[PDB]
Every structure is written in structure tokens, then in C-alpha cells.
């Protein structure tokens, strides 16, 4: 029972591991592994925290069954001196976390999914280790779903709830329950037909907010035609929706526009999409290289329906990247459906080598609006009153410069913002899983933040400046046994650090030692109007030799910060 291996070895005490943080001072974990049965194990970890002066009991339980694979986590801290000092009027200072992640497909027809997180207080993730949550999370998700799916049909019953952490507007809507049905039929003459149905119940945490029951039907019929060089798809759709709204007294007493208790919204939709492909041999760059030029066009028409009498429960503005330019929806959900009279025009150029392998691609597109897109409840704050013309432009590019080099870029511009809406770029060199360097940049204009986010976001100091973040990640092994990892994410608007991480791992035949340091943004100080930083330096030891894991742990260290590394080739 002395130092087993935590994967599948007999039950016993694992190697204790310690760390020092600015939020908890000295912390140390003493885990005990318990192999209950095959496909069933547990881990009980006393986690002593000195600043809080107590022990948090962590209980992990992993299982596998015919219904799928699942993992439960239960963290309990009976008392908290820091929380009690910060909240002296509460009856108790206990903190706790419950987490459940289950995923499974049984008999190829049944699908079970659970993604549940529940914390005792909204500040839980700013005080404790981020393993199933993060300090960057704004809310905790609580989803259940059971679905039945066969080749031409599916029906899913799901429940979605959210626990909001920010103490600005904790009111959130939940779908208890939601039922989705899709049916398909592909050989109705030359046409392909499908039907989508939904029945949802929207309920709010606050007792004075409207509750809704929504039933939606969507019959769609399309005619696809294709050639060796081109294709065209014509689609005709109906959108029928019925709303039953209750608890409208408080809302109707505060707003000049009235919500209706019974609402019917029916609208047709017409879409025409067309693609062409041209080819040429580009001998000047290199013999045998092929350049393809693909124009794409799409006309979309949806009439206008006044939707001001429907509360917005689950509709949010969608980002318009190059792929999203040809999307037929402006909002998610079904509460807001914008009228459309528009044509989207784009072009994609690809370059393949002699081995028919794609090495380069670049896409540029725009949307031209013949009439203004409106829902009847238009409250988005733009920088100007442009309503028609070329309003949205998008561009994308990916270049595999060599086997080890890769470049990616994307840009989204909106003329209504008088500025570039969003942009991202990345350049990465990667020899293998251990030798890598990556530079990335993310930008979001303050105008976009003001347009697509609540008003206090455009007012608050910590939101209104947008995003201008440059990050550098690097990793290098030494002497086939040491691994060095570093990361630095820096904000250019405030000229302040956002995240920083170092990691050193020494790997041996039978054991591995990892030392990790991180300094991260962890909160905001409303009194002095400046950010809060958290520092953490920890050491861990794991036992090798019982498996084939001879890796140097570079990839695991790359994922240990609040801005984890992703491979962009």
C-alpha cells in the first residue's frame, strides 16, 4: 500500500505533492488510490491548505459501463477562515464542488451525456485549483441529455442550467426541458426533404421574470445539382413558432413595449447557393503544382416579422467569419430571426503540391444587403447608421510553409463598426511534441465589444478596451531527459502581463519530477480599480515503469495554464 501507480495498480497511497500559492500559502496533497473493481476506481485526496488552515477532501470516482464512461468529483472544505473573514455574516464558511462528466453511446442508438458542475459560491474557482473548472470561467454549466439516433431520425431530451458567477446580473434562463427532433428523407424525387421540431420550456432563476413555452417546426426541401466543376443548391424552408408566455406583469410594468402571452410567428425562407471550381497548373512557382480558384455565391431571402412582443431567451448574435458568411441565421436559437435580403460572395484560392497535398489556402468574402436586416427589436449599438450595402467582410488564410512551419490568420471587418471587428494570427514551428515555438495574436476592437456585449462591458474599465493579446509559447528538451516549457501572454492595451508559465520536468526510467510556476490574472479589485494576480509554484512526482509512457511531459505542461497551448501545425 506504499506508493503504488495511480493508473491501475493495487490500492494504496500515491506520492504526496506540495505547492505554494498566494491564495492559500502552503498546500499539500496526500492522495490515496482505490481500485474498486475493473472499470471502477477512486481517489481520496486530503488537501491541506495553510492560509485557510484546514483540509479539503477531494473524492474522484472514474467508472466505465455499457452506458459509457463517466467521472465524478466531490470537493468538500468544512470551514474557511479567509471566506469567513470576507463574509462574516453567513452561517457557515464551508466550500464545495460537485462535478460529473459522462459520455456514452449504447447499442449505437442511445446517447447519454452529462456535463454538470455546481459550486457553493461564485468565487470558488478563484481560490482553488483549476482541474475541472477555471478561474476564467464566468459560469458553471449543468447539462443532461438522452438521445435516440438512427440513420434517418433522431430525438434528444436535454436539460440545460447555468450558475452565473458575476455579481452583476445573476438571473439566467434555463431550458427545463428541451426536446429536439430531426427527420430526413433523401429520395423524394429529385428533392431532399427534412423536418426539425423543438419543444422547450424557458424558466428563469428570478421569480419576476417571464417564463415561456415554445414549440417550433421547420420543414425544409432542397434541390441539389452538381457537375465536375460546379454545383448549385436551392432550398425552401418554413419557420413556424408558437410562444406561450407567462409572468409578464413585472416586465410589462417596466417597459413601454408589451410582451404577448400567446404569439404565433411563421415565415418562409428561400436560399440559393452556388459554387464553381477553376484549375490551373502553376509552373512558375514549381512544376506539378496546382492552383484552384473557387467562387461561391449565395442569395438569401427571409421576410420581416415584428418580434418585439417575444422576449429574447436564447438568441445571441453570431460571429461572422468566412465560413459564417454563408450562414442562413444571424442569431442563435429561435427567439430572434432577422429578415434577410442579401447576397454573400466569396472566393477561395488553394495551392496543392505535386503529391495532391494542399499546402496553401486563402479565402475572402463579403455580404451585400439589399434591405436592412431587422427583427422588430433592434437595440445593437453601432458606430454609424449603415443599413444596406457591403457591410460585412471576412478573410481567412492557412499556409503550411514546410513540415515544421505553419501560419494561420483570420480577420473580420464590419463597416457599421468603422473598424476591424476581430482578428487572429498564429505562426508555429514544431519539430515534434517536444521541440516547438508558437507566436499568436488576438484582437477584438472596443467597438465590437460595445456592439455585441452588455452596456456595462462597454462602461467597465476591465472590459471596454477590447482585446489586444500577444502570446509566445516555447518548449525544448535537453539531454533526452529534461524538458523546459515556457509561456508568456501579454496585453498591449494596458501594457500589462496576462499570463506567464514556466515548467521543468526531469524524466527517468521509473519516476518523473515536475516543477511548475505560473503567474496569472485572477480577479479585479473594485476598490482601487486594478487587476489581481495569482502566483503558484508547485512540485509533483509520478512513478514510471509500469506503462509505456516514456514521454517527457511537454504536452501536459503546455496545458497547465489559463491560456493553454493548441497545436496549429
Amino acid at each position: 500500500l506504499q506508493l503504488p501507480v495511480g493508473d491501475k495498480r493495487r490500492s494504496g497511497f500515491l506520492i504526496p505533492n506540495a505547492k505554494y500559492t498566494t491564495t492559500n500559502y502552503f498546500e499539500f496533497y496526500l492522495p490515496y488510490y482505490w481500485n474498486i473493481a475493473p472499470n471502477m476506481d477512486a481517489t481520496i485526496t486530503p488537501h491541506y491548505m495553510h492560509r485557510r488552515g484546514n483540509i479539503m477532501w477531494e473524492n474522484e470516482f472514474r467508472y466505465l459501463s455499457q452506458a459509457g464512461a463517466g467521472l465524478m468529483e466531490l470537493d468538500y472544505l468544512p470551514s474557511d477562515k479567509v471566506y469567513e473573514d470576507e463574509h462574516p455574516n453567513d452561517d457557515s464558511s464551508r466550500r464545495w464542488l460537485f462535478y460529473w462528466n459522462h459520455s456514452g453511446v449504447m447499442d449505437q442508438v442511445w446517447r447519454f451525456n452529462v456535463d454538470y458542475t455546481k459550486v457553493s459560491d461564485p468565487s470558488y474557482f478563484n481560490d482553488f485549483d483549476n482541474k475541472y473548472g477555471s478561474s476564467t470561467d464566468g459560469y458553471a454549466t449543468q447539462k443532461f441529455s438522452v438521445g435516440y439516433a438512427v440513420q434517418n431520425f433522431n430525438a434528444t431530451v436535454s436539460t440545460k442550467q447555468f450558475q452565473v458567477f458575476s455579481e452583476q446580473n445573476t438571473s439566467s434562463y434555463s431550458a427545463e426541458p428541451q426536446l429536439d427532433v430531426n427527420y430526413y428523407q433523401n429520395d423524394v424525387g429529385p428533392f431532399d426533404t427534412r423536418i426539425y421540431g423543438q419543444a422547450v420550456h424557458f424558466v428563469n432563476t428570478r421569480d419576476d421574470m417571464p417564463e415561456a413555452t415554445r414549440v417550433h417546426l421547420e420543414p425544409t426541401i432542397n434541390l441539389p445539382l452538381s457537375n465536375n466543376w460546379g454545383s448549385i443548391n436551392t432550398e425552401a424552408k418554413f419557420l413556424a413558432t408558437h410562444y406561450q408566455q407567462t409572468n409578464l406583469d413585472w416586465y410589462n410594468s417596466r417597459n413601454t413595449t408589451k410582451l404577448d402571452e400567446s404569439v404565433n410567428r411563421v415565415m418562409p425562407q428561400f436560399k440559393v447557393d452556388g459554387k464553381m471550381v477553376f484549375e490551373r497548373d502553376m509552373e512558375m512557382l514549381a512544376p506539378g503544382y496546382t492552383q484552384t480558384l473557387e467562387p461561391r455565391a449565395q442569395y438569401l431571402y427571409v421576410p420581416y416579422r415584428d418580434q418585439s412582443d417575444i422576449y429574447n431567451y436564447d438568441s445571441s448574435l453570431l460571429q461572422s467569419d468566412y465560413s459564417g458568411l454563408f450562414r442562413d441565421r444571424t442569431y442563435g436559437g429561435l427567439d430572434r430571426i432577422a429578415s434577410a435580403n442579401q447576397v454573400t460572395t466569396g472566393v477561395t484560392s488553394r495551392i496543392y503540391d505535386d503529391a495532391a497535398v494542399e499546402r496553401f489556402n486563402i479565402s475572402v468574402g463579403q455580404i451585400y444587403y439589399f434591405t436592412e436586416s431587422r427583427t422588430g427589436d433592434d437595440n445593437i449599438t453601432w458606430e454609424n447608421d449603415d443599413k444596406t450595402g457591403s457591410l460585412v467582410w471576412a478573410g481567412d488564410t492557412y499556409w503550411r510553409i514546410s513540415e515544421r512551419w505553419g501560419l494561420r490568420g483570420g480577420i473580420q471587418y464590419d463597416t457599421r463598426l468603422d473598424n476591424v471587428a476581430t482578428s487572429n494570427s498564429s505562426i508555429e514551428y514544431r519539430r515534434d511534441e517536444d521541440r516547438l515555438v508558437q507566436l499568436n495574436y488576438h484582437y477584438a476592437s472596443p467597438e465590437y465589444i460595445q456592439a455585441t456585449l452588455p452596456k456595462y462591458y462597454s462602461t467597465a474599465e476591465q472590459y471596454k478596451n477590447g482585446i489586444s493579446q500577444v502570446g509566445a509559447v516555447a518548449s525544448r528538451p535537453i539531454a533526452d531527459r529534461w524538458s523546459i516549457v515556457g509561456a508568456y501572454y501579454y496585453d498591449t492595451n494596458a501594457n500589462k502581463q496576462a499570463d506567464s508559465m514556466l515548467g521543468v520536468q526531469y524524466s527517468s526510467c521509473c519516476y518523473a519530477i515536475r516543477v511548475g510556476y505560473e503567474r496569472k490574472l485572477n480577479g479585479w479589485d473594485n476598490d482601487k480599480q486594478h487587476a489581481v494576480y495569482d502566483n503558484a509554484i508547485g512540485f509533483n512526482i509520478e512513478l514510471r515503469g509500469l506503462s509505456s509512457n516514456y514521454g517527457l511531459g511537454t504536452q501536459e505542461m503546455l496545458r497547465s495554464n489559463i491560456l493553454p497551448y493548441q497545436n496549429t501545425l
Binding site: 418554413f238 404565433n264 410567428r265 411563421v266 415565415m267 418562409p268 428561400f270 431571402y301 421576410p303 420581416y304 416579422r305 415584428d306 429578415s339 422588430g376
Partner: peptide
């Protein structure tokens, strides 16, 4: 009898005339 059934038309809600 146009109150629910006009919705299936392709015109806008503030159109006609």
C-alpha cells in the same frame, strides 16, 4: 381571417398597399 394566415406570405409585415 388573415390574422394568423398572412404569415405564410413572402411579403414583409409592414408591406401590402
Amino acid at each position: 381571417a388573415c390574422d394568423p394566415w398572412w404569415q405564410f406570405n413572402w411579403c414583409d409585415q409592414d408591406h401590402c398597399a
